[PDB]
């Protein structure tokens, strides 16, 4: 295991990101179990969202892989929890780190922008019927991200 992963893990546990729990899996030091609280004043407020993060073999030259495990209605997240985010694809840099990814996903929840991700059905609803889209996000927060 590279020394960098050891250090990042230790710092995430010793200095957690506000509103985010992130702990390594007992059997796989490259696998992280994550919980992000729905940001205040966002459509996800009140929810607790599970995510999983994996450091592939070429980390940190390659980006972490991250997915929502809690169903969520969001322009940047698909039906299987996959996340559209620049630093997860071609804007990754080894000078960034796990903490950056978690902060960036948290920021996505606080400021959903349907013009940002590659075009998709959820983003189209957020663009054209924003009020209904926000109510769907709130409804799914109650149904899937409370008592979960």
């Amino acid at each position: 295991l590279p020394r960098r992963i050891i250090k990042e893990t230790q710092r995430l546990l010793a200095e957690p990101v506000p509103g985010i729990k992130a702990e390594p899996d007992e059997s796989n030091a490259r696998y992280f179990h994550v919980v992000i609280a729905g940001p205040q004043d966002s459509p996800f407020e009140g929810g607790t969202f599970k995510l999983e993060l994996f450091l592939p073999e070429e980390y940190p030259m390659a980006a972490p892989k991250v997915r929502f495990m809690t169903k969520i209605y969001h322009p940047n997240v698909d039906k299987l929890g996959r996340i559209c985010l620049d630093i997860l694809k071609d804007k990754w840099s080894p000078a960034l780190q796990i903490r950056t990814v978690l902060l960036s996903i948290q920021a996505l929840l606080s400021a959903p922008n349907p013009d940002d991700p590659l075009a998709n059905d959820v983003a189209e609803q957020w663009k054209t019927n924003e009020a209904q889209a926000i109510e769907t996000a709130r409804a799914w927060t109650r149904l899937y991200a409370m008592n979960n």
Partner: protein, 140 residues
């Protein structure tokens, strides 16, 4: 030894299923496109030529449980088939009868299971079994 966790492995198998592999004579995909647990898969096998399975398409259900891929998936035919190791009442595949399931390794995948089942359709003890008419399925 970099171990890929179940859910990320299954997302790789999802993408591979969409791109297809080899000659396409086995294919797979997620059964429900909202299934975030990635548990239930649709499998397809094309019966191999010069056997009594030739020119027949078989649909299967493949279940990747919480311990997959350290543990094998469960597999059952939906399309009826006369084949050693396939239960006559349920369509369930008996893991003990399929070497890659009986001797499962974590390098295996949905693809491997389906390829192996298709290979075994060519075996002497299966290839000449008289088959049901097409159009029959098992219950559940």
């Amino acid at each position: 030894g970099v171990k890929v966790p179940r859910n990320f492995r299954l997302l790789e198998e999802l993408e591979e299923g969409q791109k297809g592999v080899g000659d396409g004579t086995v294919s797979w995909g997620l059964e429900d496109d909202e299934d975030m647990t990635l548990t239930r898969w649709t499998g397809m096998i094309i019966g191999p030529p010069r056997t009594n399975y030739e020119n027949r398409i078989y649909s299967l259900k493949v279940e990747c449980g919480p311990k997959y891929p350290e543990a094998p998936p469960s597999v059952r035919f939906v399309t009826k088939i006369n084949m050693n190791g396939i239960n006559n009442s349920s369509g369930m595949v008996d893991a003990r009868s399929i070497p890659v399931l009986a001797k499962w390794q974590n390098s295996y995948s949905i693809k491997v299971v389906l390829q192996e089942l298709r290979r075994l359709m060519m075996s002497k003890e299966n290839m000449k079994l008289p088959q049901p008419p097409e159009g029959q399925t098992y219950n559940n």
